[PDB]
Each structure stands twice: as C-alpha cells, then as structure tokens.
C-alpha cells in the first residue's frame, strides 16, 4: 500500500505532465497521495495563472464576514457577522492596518504558535465565497474555471443527466482569518490555488481516520452534537493541533505559499488560517473514485448548513433514501 503513514505529499509536475488534469490526479493517487487527505502541487516553472495582479482592486466583496470566536483558545466556534460591502483595494488596506496586520514573527512556526494562542481574542474579516476567477482565459493548464464539471462526471459514470453548474470561488483573507474543520459538500474533492499574498496553513485528518475526528468533535461540542448529527457541515468548529495530539487524533499540517495548488481528497477533514492579506481561488471537483464517497456522505438536515442549488441533484441521485429529509432542511 503506497503512503501507509498518510503523509502529505508534494508534487512537482513537468510542463508535459501539467497538460492533462485528470491523469495527474490519478497519478498522485497511484502514489498514495489521497491517504493524507491533502496534497501540494508546485506548478512547473514555465506556468503562470495570469500576467499580473495589478488590476484586481476594483473587485467587490459584497458581504465581508467578521469571524467572531467563542470558547477557549484550542477549542472554539466562530460565527460570521456580515459587514458592509468593500472593494478588494479597501479590504487590502484594512488587512494591512495596525488593528489587523500580521504581528512581527520569526518564522511560520512562531506565527502558528501566536495564532493558536491569540486567535480567539480578535475578530478578523474574511472575503469568502465570491463567485469568480482570476485565471487568464488563455491559461490552458490547471485553470480552475475550465475543469470538467461534477455534473458531467456523474453523467459519465452513472449515465444520468442532471441540472446544475460548478464554478470557482475567490477568497480574500487577512491575518487570523480561519477555515473551520470540514469535508467538502458531498465529500467532493477540492482544489485551491493561492494567487497572491501571504501564506495559508492547513491541517488535515487522513480520510481513513475521519470518524475519529467526528467522535472528538461530538465530545468537545456537546450542545452542537445534540442539535445535529452532522454538525461539522456547519463549518464553525475549531480544534487546535495541541488538542488533537492530546486526544490521539491522527493529522498532518503544511503551509501553502503563493503560486502553489492544494488538493483536498474525498472525506479529508481540513482546517486552517491565513498569515496575512492574500487571495485564493477554489472549486470542487469529482473523479470516478469519488462516487462511492458521495453515496456515503453524511448530511446536515437541521437547517444550518444551507448549500448550493447544485447539491440537490447529487443527493437526489446518490442518496435517494435521504433526499426527502435533507430537502426539508433546505426548505
Ligand atoms: O481557503 C479557505 O478559506 C478554505 N478552502 C477550502 O476549504 C478548500 O479549498 O477546500
Ligand atoms: Mg479590479
Ligand atoms: Ni475545503
Ligand atoms: Zn445541521
């Protein structure tokens, strides 16, 4: 069995290997990359996403989200408070202000320590989930707005044509902006490209050990767990590396820098934080290996998780027994 310790693997495809996306995902899996739940892909030196980032300041962040924490330093939830619209130029200025800027630090490890010690005492503002793309239309390789769609994959594998579309999302981050412990909708893959700015630190639980994280989460968030049998779908719970180690939960960590892709694999729980002002782009995708994970994916039916239009068909076709209850939670 390849990669039996479930380590995060880093790949350096050549320009020729960067042509066929599906084929390279399948290569990474042949080497065991999926066992970790997350892989890093460093593009060939000849590649670029676009010519420059000099003209992005007029993008609008219609609903910036202030991420307010409750709990203790290593075990907390966050809620998202909606703020007034602002442009990317305005947001960048805010991120760099004395109230929000990254503190002085020695290295990534020192910054990680400061994150876990101090995150709860501040409420950073995240421009998340903005439909759109920063890839140039002329970038033909690993362009996140030109991937094969999940609807076409389901049709190819299963023969059923379904409604729905699949487009990318932009994330503008600042120091301490946080992504809570989650898997993707319907336990899909995700791919994330860090276009510019400061790094993003990731933590991940191997898919084969996801239920260990869920069991801890139920213990640590007992009110939430009573409210919903899949409350990590709400994307609000954080657990530090120190707490995971104390409870014996297998995980790994890695820092993504500008110009690098990360791929999350089906049922790979992940969480993390941004080091300072940055912009990432991400999208879900599927492969043939996903189908069995989509059929088994947990679902939130309590009403909180509220998701895209396009998840309807996935539940309807892959999980017909669950469909009626899940849709009640949508309505
Ligand atoms: O970048 C973020 O805030 C969150 N991204 C992801 O969870 C992802 O790409 O799967
Ligand atoms: Mg602009
Ligand atoms: Ni994700
Ligand atoms: Zn729920």
């Amino acid at each position: 069995a390849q990669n039996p310790n479930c380590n995060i693997m880093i790949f350096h495809p050549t320009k020729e290997e960067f042509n066929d996306f599906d084929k390279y995902i399948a290569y990474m899996e042949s080497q065991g990359a999926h066992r970790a739940g997350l892989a890093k892909i460093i593009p060939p030196k000849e590649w670029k996403a676009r010519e420059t980032y000099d003209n992005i300041s007029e993008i609008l962040i219609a609903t910036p989200l202030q991420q307010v924490a409750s709990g203790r330093a290593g075990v907390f939830t966050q809620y998202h408070k909606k703020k007034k619209a602002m442009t990317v130029g305005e947001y960048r200025h805010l991120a760099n202000s004395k109230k929000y800027q990254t503190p002085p630090h020695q290295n990534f490890e020192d910054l990680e320590r400061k994150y876990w010690k101090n995150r709860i005492y501040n409420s950073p503002i995240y421009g998340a989930d903005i439909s759109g793309s920063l890839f140039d239309e002329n970038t033909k390789q690993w362009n996140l707005g030109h991937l094969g769609t999940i609807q076409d994959l389901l049709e190819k594998e299963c023969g059923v044509v379904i409604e729905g579309v699949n487009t990318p999302y932009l994330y503008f981050g600042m120091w301490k902006t946080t992504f809570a412990w989650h898997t993707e909708d319907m336990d899909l893959y995700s791919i994330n490209y860090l276009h510019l700015g400061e790094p993003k630190t990731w933590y991940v639980v191997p898919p084969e050990h996801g239920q260990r994280l869920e069991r801890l989460a139920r213990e640590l968030f007992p009110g939430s767990s009573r409210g919903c049998g899949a409350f990590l779908r709400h994307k609000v719970a954080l657990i530090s590396p120190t707490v995971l180690k104390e409870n014996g939960i297998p995980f790994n960590r890695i820092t993504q820098e500008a110009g690098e892709f990360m791929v999350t694999f089906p049922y790979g729980y992940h969480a993390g934080f941004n080091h300072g002002f940055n912009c990432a782009e991400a999208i879900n995708f599927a492969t043939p290996r996903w189908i069995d994970y989509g059929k088994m994916a947990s679902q939130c039916s309590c009403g909180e998780a509220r998701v895209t239009f396009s998840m309807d068909a996935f539940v309807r076709i892959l999980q017909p027994e669950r469909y009626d209850l899940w849709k009640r939670g949508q309505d």
Side-chain angles (χ1 to χ4, degrees), residues 1-47 49-50 52-81 83-214 216-244 246-305 307-327 329-330:
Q2 292 274 225
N3 193 22
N5 284 355
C6 299
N7 294 315
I8 298 166
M9 298 180 73
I10 304 165
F11 295 86
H12 288 85
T14 61
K15 68 188 189 310
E16 297 74 21
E17 283 169 342
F18 218 48
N19 284 324
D20 183 335
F21 183 84
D22 288 350
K23 182 180 194 182
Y24 202 81
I25 301 302
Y27 170 71
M28 294 161 56
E29 295 183 351
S30 80
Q31 306 302 292
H34 56 296
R35 300 200 55 185
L38 183 68
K40 179 178 289 194
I41 308 94
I42 290 174
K45 71 186 183 293
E46 300 86 0
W47 181 96
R50 67 178 304 109
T52 81
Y53 294 88
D54 295 337
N55 300 114
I56 66 168
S57 306
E58 313 305 307
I59 294 171
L60 192 68
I61 308 172
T63 308
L65 305 174
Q66 179 167 53
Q67 301 186 296
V68 181
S70 305
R72 60 185 178 96
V75 181
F76 64 89
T77 64
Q78 56 187 13
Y79 87 87
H80 291 167
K81 180 173 178 158
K83 306 295 282 184
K84 294 198 146 141
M86 76 182 79
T87 61
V88 164
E90 290 164 338
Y91 180 90
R92 178 172 63 234
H93 193 261
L94 186 69
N96 291 338
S97 70
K98 294 187 187 179
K99 180 173 175 71
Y100 290 109
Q101 70 185 206
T102 317
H105 59 281
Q106 297 297 339
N107 53 39
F108 293 170
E109 179 169 350
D110 187 27
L111 195 68
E112 181 186 38
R113 177 192 69 69
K114 287 176 190 293
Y115 174 84
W116 295 102
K117 184 179 162 56
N118 297 319
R119 158 70 184 92
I120 64 169
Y121 302 111
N122 296 90
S123 297
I125 295 169
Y126 206 171
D129 294 318
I130 295 160
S131 293
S133 186
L134 292 174
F135 284 88
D136 186 310
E137 65 179 10
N138 297 317
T139 298
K140 302 309 186 192
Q141 302 168 313
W142 284 59
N143 183 320
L144 300 190
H146 297 166
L147 300 183
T149 69
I150 299 157
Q151 300 71 24
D152 284 346
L153 181 286
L154 180 148
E155 178 185 332
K156 290 183 295 189
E157 294 299 299
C158 298
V160 67
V161 183
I162 52 170
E163 74 291 352
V165 289
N166 175 203
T167 56
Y169 295 90
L170 302 178
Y171 299 80
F172 290 94
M174 68 171 58
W175 172 235
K176 286 171 173 174
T177 56
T178 304
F179 54 110
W181 280 106
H182 70 285
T183 62
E184 306 303 308
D185 289 344
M186 222 67 184
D187 298 344
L188 287 154
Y189 294 72
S190 67
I191 184 162
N192 182 298
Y193 181 70
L194 189 51
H195 278 284
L196 63 97
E198 305 311 313
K200 188 189 293 291
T201 293
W202 301 66
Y203 304 91
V204 57
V205 175
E208 70 201 67
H209 304 302
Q211 294 87 355
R212 299 184 183 221
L213 183 69
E214 294 172 350
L216 179 62
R218 291 193 303 271
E219 295 163 359
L220 299 178
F221 303 98
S224 297
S225 175
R226 285 185 289 272
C228 179
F231 76 93
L232 297 175
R233 299 274 173 214
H234 310 167
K235 309 197 295 194
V236 299
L238 281 300
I239 309 164
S240 71
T242 294
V243 175
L244 295 179
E246 291 166 341
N247 289 278
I249 309 302
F251 78 96
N252 281 299
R253 73 194 86 192
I254 191 170
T255 298
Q256 175 190 25
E257 298 189 74
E260 306 177 340
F261 288 90
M262 311 293 301
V263 164
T264 80
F265 296 85
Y267 196 63
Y269 274 103
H270 56 282
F273 65 90
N274 297 302
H275 290 206
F277 171 71
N278 61 18
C279 174
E281 179 168 345
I283 198 176
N284 298 116
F285 73 91
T287 70
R289 196 176 68 78
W290 167 71
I291 295 283
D292 283 344
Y293 288 90
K295 294 175 172 162
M296 293 181 308
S298 68
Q299 302 301 351
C300 165
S301 315
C302 78
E304 284 301 306
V307 302
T308 182
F309 183 112
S310 309
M311 230 189 91
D312 196 281
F314 304 155
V315 184
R316 196 168 72 246
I317 299 306
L318 299 181
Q319 306 180 307
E321 186 265 328
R322 291 184 170 170
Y323 182 63
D324 278 353
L325 182 68
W326 171 80
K327 201 165 32 64
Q330 244 46 342

